[PDB]
Amino acid sequence: MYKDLEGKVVVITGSSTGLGKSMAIRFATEKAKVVVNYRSKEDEANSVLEEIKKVGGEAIAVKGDVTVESDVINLVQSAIKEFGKLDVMINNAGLENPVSSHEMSLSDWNKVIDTNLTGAFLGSREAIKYFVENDIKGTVINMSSVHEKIPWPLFVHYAASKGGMKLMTETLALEYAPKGIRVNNIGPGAINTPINAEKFADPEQRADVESMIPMGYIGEPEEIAAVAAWLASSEASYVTGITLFADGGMTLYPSFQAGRG
Amino acid sequence: MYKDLEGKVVVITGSSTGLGKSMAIRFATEKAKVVVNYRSKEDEANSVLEEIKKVGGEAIAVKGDVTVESDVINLVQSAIKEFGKLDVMINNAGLENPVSSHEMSLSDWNKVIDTNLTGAFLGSREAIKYFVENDIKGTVINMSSVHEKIPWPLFVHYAASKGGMKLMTETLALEYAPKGIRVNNIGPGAINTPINAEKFADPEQRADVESMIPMGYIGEPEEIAAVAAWLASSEASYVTGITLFADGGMTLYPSFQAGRG
Amino acid sequence: MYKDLEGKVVVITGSSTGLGKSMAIRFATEKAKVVVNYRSKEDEANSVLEEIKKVGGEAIAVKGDVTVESDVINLVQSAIKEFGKLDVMINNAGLENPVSSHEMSLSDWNKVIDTNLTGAFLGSREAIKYFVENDIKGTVINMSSVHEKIPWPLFVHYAASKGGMKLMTETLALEYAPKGIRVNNIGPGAINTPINAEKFADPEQRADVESMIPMGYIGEPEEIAAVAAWLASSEASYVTGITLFADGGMTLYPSFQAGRG
Amino acid sequence: MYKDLEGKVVVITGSSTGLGKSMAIRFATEKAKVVVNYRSKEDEANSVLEEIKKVGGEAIAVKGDVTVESDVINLVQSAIKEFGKLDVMINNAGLENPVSSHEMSLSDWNKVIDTNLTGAFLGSREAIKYFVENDIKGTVINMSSVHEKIPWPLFVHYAASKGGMKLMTETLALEYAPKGIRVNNIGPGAINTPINAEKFADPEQRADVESMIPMGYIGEPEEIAAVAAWLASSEASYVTGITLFADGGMTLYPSFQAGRG
Ligand SMILES: NC(=O)c1ccc[n+]([C@@H]2O[C@H](COP(=O)([O-])OP(=O)(O)OC[C@H]3O[C@@H](n4cnc5c(N)ncnc54)[C@H](O)[C@@H]3O)[C@@H](O)[C@H]2O)c1
Ligand SMILES: NC(=O)c1ccc[n+]([C@@H]2O[C@H](COP(=O)([O-])OP(=O)(O)OC[C@H]3O[C@@H](n4cnc5c(N)ncnc54)[C@H](O)[C@@H]3O)[C@@H](O)[C@H]2O)c1
Ligand SMILES: NC(=O)c1ccc[n+]([C@@H]2O[C@H](COP(=O)([O-])OP(=O)(O)OC[C@H]3O[C@@H](n4cnc5c(N)ncnc54)[C@H](O)[C@@H]3O)[C@@H](O)[C@H]2O)c1
Ligand SMILES: NC(=O)c1ccc[n+]([C@@H]2O[C@H](COP(=O)([O-])OP(=O)(O)OC[C@H]3O[C@@H](n4cnc5c(N)ncnc54)[C@H](O)[C@@H]3O)[C@@H](O)[C@H]2O)c1
């Protein structure tokens, strides 16, 4: 669809499953060279790799924990060594777990902040460092959430991590705009991925979530991959520092439908 | 680029010049059927019509003042009568003029509110009324500005009209999301159109505006048309109620570059 | 409570009932001189006047329709003629009525825009014109709503009017900040006033609204008057261009409590 | 000024200097019992303690590093042991240092995130845990910055920490609103404190900062303490989850004055 993506090198963290996997496949379909990332389970990575070969794409899988600095540095260097360059960096790895805020341990809080926010900072830092030192007008796409805007009781660490990601992205976008480096956030609503399989399995829970989505349906991973592909393309040449929400209307305050209140 | 746009009927208000004209040409290139709109004479409309024929597109021009209810109703009906249906409604007509707020006449205030806000409401209302009565999952795209967010001294009427447009769009998006009708805003920054030709003609004024754009350059109309085409396509199927800023970073607070403050 | 408010002249539009009335009484208690405004029913005005005399305050009532330019001009001039000066202008008059957006008449749309937005512009314009011509560091407080942020199906005209008010206020705040003129918005959530008496009368409707308020209760007019008094005082000397929401948490997305979604 | 603050117990982190010190003195003047906090030595704390005695207030100083969990837990317990209860928790400690984002070490990033964000989480958690277990309708005030909204090149860690603080505060506000616990942010612009003494010492730097403030002057600590006192009082009974900016108009986009752009 986007001719300018052909030959571009795209790195995606946490891309052995869910949204990361869907984006890896979409970029492969756009003829971009993809670097998949797995934390520990290499088998899941080989799976995404087979889907990519299925569409005639070219890709490699690199092990790396985004909370380990040397792993992030190595991930970026691996892309350059294998494909000769780096064009798009997508920080997608993340985690979440529910705990009442006043009962949340420092350990749980740090795990989420370290992975969701600091991990994205490291990925962004390494990609931009490369872009700057080589005069490349690359782009960084950070995977956020409707929760960088919508508060989330029981997930205060997650909400804080995404709210922080918003300001990190806007700051990097402003700081490097003069060099032609675009930095944007994608803010997905409820999407059908493994992180929600069990929740969406229960008919009561599923109906509950759907009631919070104005459009009435839980989105598919491909609907988010479509956003990532567009933002990475030259079609979005004048777009930087934004958060593009793809949430079926979640951020519009679903409880106020029908003129309630 | 977007195969799903082929055969879609797109109506664009104030499309005989500037952004409206560029969008008309882009949609024609996507093989959509376009309805161009001019306020009084049709010479400016003939240029766009010729540009559309040049790319093998199909289009018609309809006279209509967006501040006149019957004109807006007729504009929508003309699309249906000529092409048999309506798929995308783009409210783009607008005007602006500088006046110190405490010296602004009610006449100037009303002219801008009537055209920029009420005109968009009328266009949105008529398109949605049609979509609802015919079970069509159409879309409405409203042309806003970075000024639905960035205050604008000397243009208080314009800022108010776009701030109002933001809430109008988000309300319509929430209200009709259950019916599959998407409503979104595009927020352009400084773009090279006739409304800025004189301003950008002066080397001092041009450099002044460029200093307020982090990316360092004034955008081209095609960069905004690219956004409209994507938002109208099924690629943005899960996107509704948002304002997609295409401003080279204007909303990121340009005065804070280099860690100032 | 605020010693600096003693002797200040405060004008409040639509202050014969509800929030306007409560603010009139609160300012009288702060020893400010108040100018009450009624559109037609003078009897309601005399009532507020009696409450003010009850607290030993000084006030006058002036007839005026905020949609009539000469009435707004006269309202401001009356304050100056009676008390010799003007210090605080509060644009509070407003109206709302539910109608599905695609069925809303231009007449209903205009009535709300004219009263809620244009009326506030006129009041703001006249107050600021006076402040500027007399080197007075006055303040303007505009009564908004959580709906300058929260979309409102069935009330698209109201939402647009408040969204417009937000940008109008921020623009005026930026434009006149150098002259020491502060302009701020107050954004009330659901408050117990006559405009909601019937709605809150029904046990089912009342419980429905309360479910949308995190704090669990519908606010009282005095809780909003407290905000107005503080914003008008020198305690808020460095505060301008903001919208202070007093909504029990409505803008925090009530549907997401308990980690839902 | 606020009679309801008499006898209330207020804990303020990092209150031996700057804004924390000013707030400690203001609350003492409101007859509240204050718990001052210093990181290592206590000389700076003794100054505040003497200022508090000067106004006839009652206070104690407690050593504590907000990045050390046991220190935060002890700080809260010390207030309860000394004064018998806790009513207001103010997380004010913070730090910042400039470094180009692509050159920022993980060490610098973590130091700021740990202190500014995680430290505030710990303070909020301990205060709320106490409030919940004792059915106390207490309040938490978190010291943010205009930079939870305005991006800040060279201070990406600071911006991320405050953006994260915004979502943390809004989440806690929503989560505990049903229990009557209010949680709000104060967002100061440029204020005259020791953290800016050197910067504001230079005539060129000072004039540079003032040019980014619409009101034209750098705020004083007392102007921020005024906001904290009001938010803690019952006057703000219906206010929760907001960020009250006290910035002289900084968030209004200063570069757009005079209708530029
Ligand atoms: N699924 C949704 O509805 C939804 C909504 C909003 C935001 N998101 C965000 O989108 C991203 C993708 O989520 P998803 O649904 O595909 O979830 P997912 O769990 O399937 O994908 C996240 C991936 O991150 C990897 N990962 C976690 N910690 C890592 C670490 N330290 N190092 C390396 N890899 C690590 C996981 O192994 C996993 O494959 C996440 O950042 C998530 O917060 C998802
Ligand atoms: N050019 C920019 O930099 C910029 C930035 C932000 C927003 N916008 C918005 O984008 C839209 C397009 O602006 P543009 O630059 O192409 O300006 P433009 O003046 O070239 O286009 C606006 C068109 O609206 C038409 N129009 C005005 N009033 C009308 C009425 N009552 N009925 C019918 N047609 C009417 C005009 O004749 C004109 O062709 C406007 O809404 C504008 O506010 C433009
Ligand atoms: N009550 C709430 O819950 C709530 C929530 C958000 C916002 N508000 C806003 O606060 C303001 C006060 O609302 P309220 O609850 O006291 O309602 P209200 O109806 O009691 O007060 C509004 C007043 O405006 C007057 N008014 C209307 N049109 C006028 C005109 N053209 N000229 C002069 N006066 C006119 C009315 O006569 C009335 O006394 C309104 O702007 C409203 O939109 C109220
Ligand atoms: N001064 C401003 O213009 C301005 C603008 C926006 C925000 N703020 C914020 O307001 C707060 C107050 O800033 P300030 O100007 O008074 O600065 P400051 O440096 O004078 O005060 C911060 C205090 O935090 C203490 N502190 C730092 N790390 C600590 C730790 N780990 N444990 C305990 N105490 C620690 C410091 O010793 C210091 O006394 C900060 O959070 C700052 O980010 C200040």
Q: Write out the distinct hetero groups bound to the structure.
A: nicotinamide-adenine-dinucleotide
Architecture of chain A, according to CATH? 3-Layer(aba) Sandwich
Order of helical and strand elements of chain A: EHEHEHEHEHEHHHE
Oligomer: homotetramer
> Which fold name fills CATH's third level, the topology of chain A?
Rossmann fold
The CATH class of chain A is Alpha Beta
Terminal CA distance of chain A reads: 44 Å
Helix content of chain A: 40-55%
- Under CATH, the homologous superfamily of chain A reads NAD(P)-binding Rossmann-like Domain
Characterize the main sheet of chain A.
7 strands, parallel
Family (chains A, B, C, D): Belongs to the short-chain dehydrogenases/reductases (SDR) family.
Catalytic activity (chains A, B, C, D): D-glucose + NAD(+) = D-glucono-1,5-lactone + NADH + H(+); D-glucose + NADP(+) = D-glucono-1,5-lactone + NADPH + H(+)
InterPro entries (chains A, B, C, D): NAD(P)-bd_dom_sf (IPR036291), Sc_DH/Rdtase_CS (IPR020904), SDR_fam (IPR002347)
Protein name (chains A, B, C, D): Glucose 1-dehydrogenase
Topology:
Four copies of one chain form a homotetramer.
Chain A: E1 9-12, H1 18-29, E2 33-38, H2 42-54, E3 58-63, H3 69-83, E4 88-91, H4 106-133, E5 139-143, H5 156-176, E6 182-188, H6 197-201, H7 203-210, H8 221-232, E7 243-246
The complex binds nicotinamide-adenine-dinucleotide (NAD) (4 copies).
Residues 13-14, 16-20, 39, 65-67, 92-95, 115, 119, 143, 145, 188, 190-191, 193-196 of chain D line the site of one nicotinamide-adenine-dinucleotide (NAD).
